[PDB]
Design a protein around this ligand. Structure first.
Ligand SMILES: O=P(O)(O)OC[C@H]1O[C@H](O)[C@H](O)[C@@H](O)[C@@H]1O
Ligand SMILES: [Zn+2]
Length: 455
């Protein structure tokens, strides 16, 4: 199998090219072998709404079966519903077949074994098992499990909206259309659906709410229908994007402000995790409410590991993955996060625009990407960590280099999903933003004078 599909956070490839039916089978063999090595014969399996779903999921399941695993096949579900299965069934392993927000031909695997979401060396260990033929052999079994009604009821029964809201819901023709509009209505909303038919051709915008262009239709519909809120889901439903009643995009780090206030209010001293891409304002806000802010690495599986290590009650990252442990299970879930948001907003007499605008804001950049090479990106970061000078500031090298200054911050790190450097900048003023950008421009040039500095 090609090494490139074994990534830091998950497995991801292109069907017909780097990901085939046979590769899915052997990946299932590897996962079932690791699950058995951890004392867990029971493995839940789910798939999203992609065209290659049926082909690859059958092979994934047979690979698990051929280890001697007992598979619980939950069919086509959102990613968090597969994570839910792996938390509420007797078995604590699960595999989701998904390509997330990528174009139609992409697919992949998000993997939980004996309660732990695999990352980094553990994902490589699967590749290595297949190369070594270090694989279990047995006569397993498959049972059908219809889990979505239990998930739906679990959420509905714990959410208490204080008044009705009208909400536009954009599923981007991804799998969130199997539940999100239905569940949000059941909470006590009117729902205007946009692209809520599941269609793996993604004939409208790709289900990727991190790009403003994929929210254009949502924003227009919110305005036209005088809705209270707009929500957009990514293809597999583990990410959510939010738009206010006036069309303002609320990025996930400011959504986390509202959620952190909520969670900490009932849980004094609670740890709250955010990634290195998130606003410094969220850090002061968590501390102010008496929570413990914990900055960590970008990446869903890395965040989940950190939540286990710290006992954090809430985590989020700038990509829109939000992870509730309080009243929940600790995994990322756009659908559940949407419900928690509606709960909070419904208890406020103000519109969603004013709830969010009340929080301090700074000037920030759209995420910047510089294309380098896959085989150099980590070395550029290592060179910065060894060589760079940042002036006076609080330097964090847990994921790339982030420097927090009195009036702003900057970040450079390697993407683990693409061959690029990722940068973000934020400051109280344009003048400071430009000062920080100049520091980073010059430090990149000091490592390699030839690097593009397109910011
Ligand atoms: O910045 P990157 O390493 O490219 O990762 C950006 C995002 O990629 C995927 O969407 C993962 O599911 C997210 O957890 C991560 O935040
Ligand atoms: Zn996703």
């Amino acid at each position: 199998l090609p090494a490139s599909i074994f990534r830091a956070y998950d497995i991801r490839g292109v069907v017909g090219d780097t990901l085939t039916a046979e590769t899915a089978y052997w990946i299932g063999r590897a996962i079932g072998s690791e699950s058995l090595a951890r004392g867990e014969p029971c493995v839940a399996v789910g798939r999203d709404g992609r065209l290659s779903g049926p082909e690859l999921v059958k092979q994934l399941i047979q690979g698990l079966v051929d280890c001697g695993c007992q598979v619980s096949d939950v069919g086509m579900v959102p990613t968090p519903v597969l994570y839910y299965a792996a938390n509420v069934l007797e078995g604590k392993s699960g595999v989701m077949l998904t390509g997330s927000h990528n174009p139609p031909d992409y697919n992949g695997f998000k993997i939980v074994v004996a309660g732990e979401t695999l990352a980094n060396e553990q994902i490589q260990a699967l590749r290595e098992r297949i190369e070594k033929n270090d694989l279990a052999s047995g006569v397993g079994s498959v049972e059908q499990v219809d889990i979505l009604p239990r998930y739906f009821k679990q959420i509905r029964d714990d959410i208490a909206m204080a008044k009705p809201m009208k909400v536009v819901v954009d599923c981007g023709n991804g799998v969130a259309g199997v539940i999100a509009p239905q569940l949000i209505e059941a909470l006590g909303c009117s729902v205007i659906p946009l692209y809520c038919e599941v269609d793996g051709n993604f004939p409208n915008h790709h289900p990727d709410p991190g790009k403003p262009e994929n929210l254009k239709d949502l924003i227009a519909k919110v305005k036209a229908e005088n809705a209270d809120l707009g929500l957009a889901f990514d293809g597999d439903g583990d990410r959510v994007g939010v738009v206010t009643n006036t069309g303002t995009i609320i990025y996930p780090d400011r959504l986390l402000m509202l959620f952190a206030k909520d969670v900490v209010s009932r849980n004094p001293g609670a740890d709250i995790i955010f990634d290195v891409k998130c606003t410094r304002r969220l850090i002061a806000l968590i501390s102010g409410y008496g929570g413990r802010p914990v900055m960590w690495k970008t990446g869903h599986s890395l965040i989940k590991k950190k939540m286990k290590e710290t006992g954090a009650l809430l985590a989020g990252e700038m990509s829109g993955h939000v992870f509730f442990k309080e009243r929940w299970f600790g995994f990322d879930d756009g659908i559940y996060s949407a419900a928690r948001l509606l709960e909070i907003l419904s208890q406020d007499q103000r519109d969603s625009e004013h709830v969010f605008s009340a929080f301090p804001s700074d000037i920030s950049t759209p995420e910047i990407n510089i294309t380098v090479t896959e085989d150099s990106k980590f070395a550029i970061i290592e060179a910065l960590q060894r060589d760079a000078q940042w002036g006076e500031g609080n330097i964090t090298t847990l994921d790339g280099v982030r420097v927090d200054y009195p009036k702003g911050w900057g970040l450079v790190r390697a993407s683990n999903t693409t061959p690029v450097l990722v940068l973000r900048f934020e400051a109280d003023t344009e003048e400071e933003l430009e000062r920080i950008k100049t520091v980073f421009r010059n430090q990149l040039k000091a490592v390699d004078s030839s690097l593009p500095v397109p910011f």
